Design a protein around this ligand. Structure first.
Ligand code: NAD
Ligand code: NAD
Ligand code: NAD
Ligand code: NAD
Ligand code: AKG
Ligand code: AKG
Ligand code: AKG
Ligand code: AKG
Lengths: 414, 414, 414, 414
């Protein structure tokens, strides 16, 4: 139902071969433990009854309860949600979080629903799967087209159903409902932090580096903002409405005001308007896919001009694109490290909730950044000492998949 | 992963149109409420690890908890299980049972596993979905390649997990584990009873009728036994191994002894060995598909030679076949009526379990036969007055769908 | 700590060998699945704190939830409670009830506690084991020195803890708290029914038959009353205070008056006062142990003068006694049949609770009496064809054990 | 069935009398609240069915949920398991942990089972008691012949049954499954820390002190390793295969190599081979029982040559031995203090799980070591002022019991 699953299975096959895993073990890791599909009907403002389908994929729980966000979008499919859940397994393993991989999606265009409709949609999604949710079973969060407001609805419905004011069942919550202020921008803070560290290690430094970012929402906006503060030059931004290239630099806050008033960054007046396709293959130092998956494939990988790719989106490169970047000498900082700001921020939110709320937002910001940087340093050091002939995704996946396999063996599952 | 779902959805649109239901209502009905996919891995003693995928489709619960069996089979798919779960919703509604429709399947060749491997499989299937099973949630049962032994494993695992000796969570159980003796043969008793009644109504009676049955398992054997006892001549039986025709009559018990000692009824000595395709188009009075779906289609339907077809299997004739039978004046008694002796018997088992186990076996036999004759008579009489331009299948589905819709309306769901 | 467990295990290995069971299979059956020991402390009316030990033995659950009574007594031990739970398994199997074998007891002299102290004891007993009780887990009942009042306390504590008004968690309840009138006297009705039927089969009938009953409580009294009404002559009754013999017959209702006003039937004026030992070896036609276990043994079995022993008590004869009675031509009707009116009455009470209370007292009486006579008649006819070289106890045990083994095999447990 | 329970109850009445407790109060403390016995049957690799008995003793829960390990061994009995659970109560009280005393064991020779057989055993053990386990009910852990691998199986079974990924239900877990690195060696670190501190207080310090350790497993090895690093001379080690003495010192890492390659430290080439009996009475400065209970008794206590005994094992000295060591001027550091590094490490693991995993390995090490030294220093200073006429064990028990009694009084239980 989606090519992302084909890509994510192929990336797993490649690391499994490198680890010397048996074919059958790879098969177990390639398939999710449990997937739920659910029907949601809502009565719209116009009086019309509409039916939507959603999923929750629970890929792997060797290392703890399932963890991952929920996306709303008109092209969401079962296999997309499954694939996204597999990326969560690896990310959570890499960052040594006590979490397996989970993900959800509803096949809907949220831009065409009222707030009341979206609320009703959100509540019913939780209602239909809740026997397989819990703060120690499967903890959702935001993703494309969901946000702290979605999480407040999710939480309120869970409280309604279970009677338990369990803050820890959802992350990305508003800070007045048990969330943490840092989680709002923790993905982009992590992508910026990692991009800067990566640029210092690999391309001569971040200062004056020309950066193109695809997508301008929760990840893309904050990534732009923080990279701008760090002295990079943001020369390209885009969203679903298209992109803008300006070699003089984009005013990031102004661009957000353009989205707020017009609905797309493409309406930014000073710059060359471009297709998303053109934006990805335009000249830059660093390219940061921050929107959707499979945006760089066997067709455009040969035309990417960036020296350094940092993955803010989940699964923006196909398995072919991986091989092409390796052959071309383009350094790719993988999603499972680069974007882990999100889930590491959720971890702190979740642990704070379990602890009864005693972590400050300033401690939380430090905890997130430190884990991210420490993870990068571990990855770099394993790369240099054990897998110097492999790309960084391969090394990160080797660490991630090795840990999952060990835990499943200990538990008698393999 | 199957056309059986395409067929069921298409039938529902036609029936909804006939009932004057709007597109939006039909959309709700055509989508399952919840479907779970689960991964099962097993290590043989040979040492090899194998992975199997299974499903539980919970189609509709307007009228009660989900109810339906679980098939094992190497060609089982997600769409096949969803489709069979829709057939269960309608047959359950048609027979005025307090149940909605569900079904499960695992994609495995059970003939290639050891008994211990099958047990491990069956236990793990139940474990992986159990939070959405229960005696007032979803009550499984047998189907193809599963049986009382399978239900003993299901039950024992469920006891392990829940701590509760809730006999009612599964039907088709062994008598010594909360089952009822009549359930073993209730489907085939129902098929024979219905075939006799229809034969009396339409082709001059059951005595001396030449009957051909495809499949010789739980449905097919007992159908054959009861029709033998009722005066009919069984001239053809079959199974996955092929069939056997003898115009002088098959000895039904000897034939089972052939299955038992050789693995297939095709080894019966006294008759012509034939393929299944050939059995289905051989001369007879009554033809009873009792194996698998979609065995009679636009290609062999013109060649079938029977006066009366009684559907023991779920979904044995395609819509093209129904059309051709109508034109040819071949009577078809639909599965949702004819084979409902299984799920009615399961109702009696489940009710007996809930009431603490009091209902005697004889009264059980009576309750099943009465309900099924009454349903046929009701449907027969109804058809004279409304939907006279439609086949029996269409009328039966119309009543089944109408009842479901009425319950959803009452519950504020539509 | 009780010779009763040695008798039970020893009797079990003999039956296993006759059934041709592996030694390893018998090892499984000879050990309970779960046994709980609990501590109960009570602040007495004097002001003294006292500690009591109690147990719950859950022996086998192959055929259903554990079922059996709780006894209070100063000589109660862990192994007595285990042994009595094994007897429950075999009797529940024999009578084809959907129940396994359980038993409880507390090591206490209840005659030296106040009512409020006995309440506190009873409540604490249920509290400390409740996570392994339930109407589909383990359903307790009365036994020695417990009664419907005890059951009412047990129930009220279970409702307090769980918040569910689940009447089916205890049987022997008062009829205003979900009990049934017939359960008060169903044990004695069963014993009397069975004694008359055996008397008709083997000694020319009940009318004028001289009966001696040991024990005059729930089992003893009702046995006496019903045998009197059936036309037997009750020539001897006893309780823990001693016995009374009157060859002209005892007035049973008057004897109960004597017990209520003096505390022992030994104070019955018109008769010869005897020790319990003397009672058991006194001349009579029918002897009915209806007090405690192991009362007839290698020392007094040679001196018993009855034609027919009917076991009201659990385990009144030792294995040596069985051998002597066989050699002497004394017919013994084993406890697992003769006394099953209690647990069969419990079954009706439990099913009635589960059903919502449908079944009337008169239907209930009939169901119990019929199951008993049917069971005796089945056992009798069976015994002519199979195990004709063994006594009635042995053939009953053979059937009982065989059914359990079959259910365990079905469940993969053996 | 173990002399250990007699020692414990006897030691308890002495402490009670010193505390001025009523005999009736001591009766309550001397009896466990709940004890479960379970049956476990396993189909072995040969094809033979074997049955094993196991127990869970939940002794006291006044101060919190029950806490303590599970031991596998062919001499394990119900009363040994009860006695060890009492030791847990007193040590958890002494260390001011929010836990009561529990213990488990299974009567089995684990050295004669395959890994798969041990897995099956472990899983079934947890399954049969799970309704009285939970992270706030009863938290098990390792002991003799159990280890983090055992804990992983226990956990995976608990997740299977409950569907909750509750890491805090077991401690001693692998660090990838919610364990902590320091827990592997926290018992030995505690013993070594305490031995050094006592050596400094009482014998002029640890450097060059001659140490003899009985047992070379989780406690024994790490004790040896850490004392070596602290500058002690390890002159004697043993295991169930016998012992080795070398007055020049044993190479501790080499000895573990010998164990791994030969199965016993007795195969250590450079040293005099001795019986365990001989080891215990060999000349040394510090003697550390770190294997089993009751190894020093009235027969060998007169012949022990150490200045200082530090109890790594539970219950290694009998009451007679305590009296002799007191008369001889041999200082004994009791198990409830010396060995509490295990359960204090378990506490940190459990709190860390509840907190969401905040606490680092280095903070964890510090917390354990500090609580131990603080506890020893508190006990030392206390002992100068109160109970100065009693040994260290007696004063520790006095505090431990007094805290429990106070908590029970507060709860109305006493
Ligand atoms: N939110 C999180 O914490 C988080 C964490 C890790 C990774 N991610 C990944 O980051 C990516 C973006 O998530 P988000 O939270 O920023 O979502 P968002 O809904 O806040 O923003 C999505 C942005 O992408 C744009 N976009 C959508 N479809 C596009 C298309 N086809 N081409 C170009 N741009 C398009 C939108 O217009 C918008 O700017 C996704 O892959 C998501 O899985 C998100
Ligand atoms: N078991 C019930 O109570 C019940 C109730 C209603 C409907 N049904 C339906 O009846 C049919 C038979 O089920 P069953 O319970 O008797 O199954 P079963 O496993 O007991 O028997 C199946 C029989 O069909 C044969 N068969 C299998 N694949 C075949 C193929 N490709 N071609 C020909 N024969 C084949 C087998 O060899 C065997 O003889 C199925 O459609 C099932 O869903 C069963
Ligand atoms: N109550 C039931 O439903 C039921 C059912 C089946 C079997 N049983 C068995 O029947 C027997 C009696 O049970 P009950 O319910 O009548 O008990 P009960 O407490 O109602 O009466 C016990 C009677 O036995 C007497 N007794 C006690 N100890 C004695 C001794 N050592 N010697 C002589 N007499 C003694 C008492 O004085 C009293 O008369 C027990 O073995 C019990 O397990 C009871
Ligand atoms: N593991 C813990 O966290 C912990 C904590 C506190 C106390 N303890 C106690 O420490 C002792 C040892 O536990 P462990 O975890 O090290 O066990 P283990 O299974 O890791 O090692 C046991 C060691 O003792 C040896 N041994 C066994 N029986 C023996 C015998 N009869 N004579 C001599 N040596 C024998 C074995 O060969 C092995 O070297 C036990 O008393 C245990 O209850 C353990
Ligand atoms: O914060 C989370 O747990 C979910 C974020 C996410 O889904 C992601 O990392 O892509
Ligand atoms: O008896 C049942 O519940 C299952 C019956 C069924 O699945 C069927 O009718 O095909
Ligand atoms: O009625 C019951 O369940 C208990 C009866 C009993 O314990 C017994 O038969 O001895
Ligand atoms: O760490 C635990 O909980 C168990 C330790 C233990 O059993 C012991 O102290 O002997």
């Amino acid at each position: 139902t989606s090519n992302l699953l084909v890509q994510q299975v192929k990336k797993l096959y490649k690391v499994g071969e490198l680890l010397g895993l048996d074919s059958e073990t790879i098969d177990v890791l390639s398939q999710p433990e449990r997937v739920m599909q659910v029907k949601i009907q809502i009565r719209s403002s116009d009086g019309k009854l509409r039916t939507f389908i959603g999923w929750r994929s629970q890929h792997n729980s060797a290392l703890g309860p399932y963890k991952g966000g929920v996306r709303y979008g008109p092209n969401v499919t079962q296999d997309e949600v499954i694939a996204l859940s597999m990326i969560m397994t690896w990310k959570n393993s890499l960052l040594l979080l006590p979490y397996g991989g989970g993900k959800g999606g509803i096949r809907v265009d949220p831009k065409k629903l009222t707030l009341k409709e979206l609320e009703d949609l959100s509540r019913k999604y939780v209602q239909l799967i809740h026997k397989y949710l819990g703060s120690d079973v499967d903890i959702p969060a935001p993703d494309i087209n969901t946000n702290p407001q979605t999480m407040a609805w999710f939480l309120d419905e869970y409280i309604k159903i279970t009677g338990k004011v369990d803050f820890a069942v959802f992350t990305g919550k508003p800070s007045e409902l048990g969330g943490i202020g840092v989680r709002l921008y923790s993905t982009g803070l992590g992508v910026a932090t990692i991009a800067r560290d990566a640029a210092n290690k690999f391309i001569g430094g971040i200062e004056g580096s020309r950066v193109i970012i695809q997508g301008f929402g929760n990840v893309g906006f904050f990534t732009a903002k923080f990279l701008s503060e760090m002295g990079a030059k943001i020369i390209g931004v885009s969203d679903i409405g298209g992109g803008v290239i300006n070699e003089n630099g984009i005013d990031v806050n102004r661009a957000l005001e353009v989205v707020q008033s017009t609905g797309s960054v493409v309406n930014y007046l000073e710059g060359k308007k471009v297709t998303n396709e053109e934006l990805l293959i335009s000249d830059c130092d660093i390219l940061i896919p921050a929107a959707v998956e499979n945006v760089i494939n066997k067709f455009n990988a040969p035309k990417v001009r960036a020296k350094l790719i940092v993955e803010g989106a989940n699964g923006p490169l196909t398995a072919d694109a991986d091989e092409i970047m390796k052959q071309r000498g383009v350094i790719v900082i993988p999603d499972i490290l680069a974007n882990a700001g999100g889930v590491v921020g959720s971890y702190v939110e979740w642990a704070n909730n379990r602890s009864g709320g005693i972590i400050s937002d300033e401690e939380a910001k430090k905890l997130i950044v430190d884990r991210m940087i420490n993870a990068f340093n571990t990855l770099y050091d394993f790369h240099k000492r054990k897998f110097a002939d492999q790309d960084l995704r391969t090394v990160a996946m080797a660490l991630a998949v090795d840990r999952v396999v060990g835990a499943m063996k200990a538990r008698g599952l393999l």
